[PDB]
Design a protein around this ligand. Structure first.
Ligand SMILES: CC(C)S[C@@H]1O[C@H](CO)[C@H](O)[C@H](O)[C@H]1O
Ligand SMILES: CC(C)S[C@@H]1O[C@H](CO)[C@H](O)[C@H](O)[C@H]1O
Lengths: 144, 286, 285
């Protein structure tokens, strides 16, 4: 049953810089890669009602969740309070993804660096957020 | 430490005609003003290895560059030695520019919005908009400044080249002639200046050391003559007064002959004593 | 300004660990005073960023590479790629460098001293992202205790006579502390001092006030040029140098007449570049 603006289930995750690149783990980083049609590009999104946040686990590795490390990178890790995400829906399928917790007493958010709209080989980072207008912090969640 | 207590101008690598400008707690990007509104004292804290960037405002005397966390805005606020009032000065070697990162949160650096004409904090990129030119305020003010040079004994008179073909330099009443105007250029390799007379393309103020204390203009087509270069040192308590010493031998000062203020009095070099006839106001032409 | 300089790169968080390279693998390792820890900085002015090329004698084409998107740093063949360019940001006052990826300037090199390798991190105030970049000669010679042998006779060395007699001559090597010198680089003065190990503050000095005579005197006085020297590598060699005085760089360290006899004098003489002005600076066996 739906509690929020973003149903539970399996999603592909994409940067607005590309409709053909998909979030998956490469080694310990997260990155956007060519369509593989495999489970490592499928992400299970799950609402946690107690604290109004979302947990996002990889379906090829169901006990690993999107998290962050002490070096500024998004990571795939065991459950902890770092796995809680607070989305801001800014369009039909487009979201900004804040860490639930203030980091360095600011909002921090998923962030993918681009070079003239190219993101190939870029790791997904966790960086300060100030508003809803940063292209490098906009991501699409597609039901699939 | 090398930057500690230095008074500087900060300008934008993305638009070198825009400078950090301060008034009543607001920081903006403005054209060059050659005055305190665009001057900042860099104050080092050795424990933090970071710097406060203090405004030289003459009215509000305790104002420093401040990050308005959690926003991305920048302002000037009363110095309380807070982390959001400290900055890392990271020199981008080979680009001669600085990235200026918040000590409080080094994920964030100063970003020049040349369209709004102000500053914000930003994550990093490879653009010129996070790169700044930090420069001693005297060099900043005098570099590419077209001026007249008057002795402080008579501010109505000026140092002039006699005419296009007579390269002697003497003192004369100000008549707005181009022969009475010099463009200053700083040479970063030699850490000294040249004075280009505007009545010629390459004529620079030079100590003719093969003839006593005589100074004349000569072509800068000459490659490596330290006699053509000068140090310009401010006299304290003043905004426009300087002493002018020669790079070849810094004991030699630009000197008004005998302290005489008559038309035609010789301009020379002479052993530095810091009397009034070795003091020069470098001024904007009216 | 740093273009084509050959440097060592060491960790601010642990100044005994240097960037070390072999067969594509980058690690942090103790001081080697050799090519394994030497890197050429190659400036691209359009990017205002540097390639960092290993001086490996076997493979001459390896450069420091970020294996984006991973956390891993290695050396790979130079293909002039964005992940092989680096911004050298000098933290003024602190006299250290932050080394940021051109490919993603939000990420900088991080010294994992426990794993003895390099990783990446976003910017912070820790020493683990700070690095010391130093001309390799300065790196090898600074705080190096050595013996100084002329090219003409290697089995002999430059020595102070004893703890009370402060004169300096040539004498056969016998491992005495009067025959060993600890080199200190003065960053303020861009020049070196030679401290004789038999004394605490006795430095090789050119007694200008008595012609070409060089002795050792106290280093206590705040300002001098005779106490300091410049050390310049003879090309095509790995341990030979000339040693010129800071006061007057035309005056080089000279073995009197080219005589290799015990007691022969050592004094500054006009630089001719002949064999009696060339010195092997060596590790003591
Ligand atoms: C009356 C003079 C001795 S004053 C004397 O004249 C000199 C002329 O070379 C210099 O200008 C000196 O600065 C000045 O003090
Ligand atoms: C036989 C000598 C002329 S050789 C001569 O002696 C000089 C003594 O000051 C210097 O040491 C010179 O380097 C050397 O060539």
């Amino acid at each position: 049953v739906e509690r929020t603006f973003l149903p539970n289930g399996n999603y592909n995750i994409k940067s607005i810089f590309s409709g053909s690149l998909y979030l998956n783990p490469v080694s310990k980083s997260l990155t956007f890669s060519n369509e593989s049609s495999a489970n490592n590009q499928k992400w299970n999104v799950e609402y946690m009602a107690e604290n109004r946040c979302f947990k996002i686990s990889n379906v090829a590795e169901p006990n690993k969740y999107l998290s962050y490390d002490n070096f500024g990178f998004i990571s795939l890790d065991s459950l902890s309070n770092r796995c809680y995400w607070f989305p801001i829906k800014i369009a039909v399928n487009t979201y900004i993804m804040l860490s639930l917790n203030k980091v360095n007493e600011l909002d921090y958010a998923w962030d993918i660096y681009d070079t003239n709209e190219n993101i190939l080989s870029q790791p997904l980072l966790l960086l300060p957020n100030f508003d809803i207008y940063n292209s490098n912090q906009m991501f699409k969640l597609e039901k699939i | 430490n090398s930057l500690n207590d230095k008074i500087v101008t900060i300008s934008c690598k993305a638009d070198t005609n825009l400078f950090f400008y301060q008034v009543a707690g607001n920081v903006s990007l403005f054209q060059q003003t050659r005055n305190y509104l665009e001057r900042w004292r860099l104050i080092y804290d050795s424990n933090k290895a970071a710097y406060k960037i203090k405004s030289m405002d003459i009215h509000n005397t305790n104002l420093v560059l401040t990050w308005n966390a959690p926003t991305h805005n920048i302002s000037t606020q009363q110095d309380s030695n807070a982390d959001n009032q400290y900055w890392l000065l990271l020199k981008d070697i080979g680009n001669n520019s600085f990235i200026i990162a918040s000590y409080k949160n080094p994920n964030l650096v100063l970003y020049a919005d040349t369209v709004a004409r102000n500053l914000k904090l930003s994550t990093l990129n490879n653009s010129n908009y996070i790169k700044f030119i930090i420069e001693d305020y005297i060099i900043s003010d005098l570099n590419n400044f077209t001026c007249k040079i008057s002795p402080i004994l008579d501010l109505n008179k000026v140092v002039q080249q006699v005419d296009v073909t007579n390269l002697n330099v003497n003192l004369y009443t100000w008549d707005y002639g181009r022969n009475q105007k010099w463009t200053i250029r700083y040479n970063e390799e030699k850490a000294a200046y040249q004075f280009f007379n505007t009545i010629l393309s390459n004529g620079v103020l030079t100590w003719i050391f093969s003839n006593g204390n005589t100074v004349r203009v000569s072509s800068s087509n000459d490659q490596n003559n330290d006699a053509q270069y000068w140090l310009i040192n401010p006299v304290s308590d003043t905004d426009e007064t300087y002493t002018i010493t020669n790079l070849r031998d810094t004991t030699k000062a630009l000197d008004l002959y005998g302290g005489q203020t008559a038309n035609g009095t010789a301009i020379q070099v002479f052993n530095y004593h810091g009397d009034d006839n070795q003091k020069w106001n470098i001024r904007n032409p009216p």
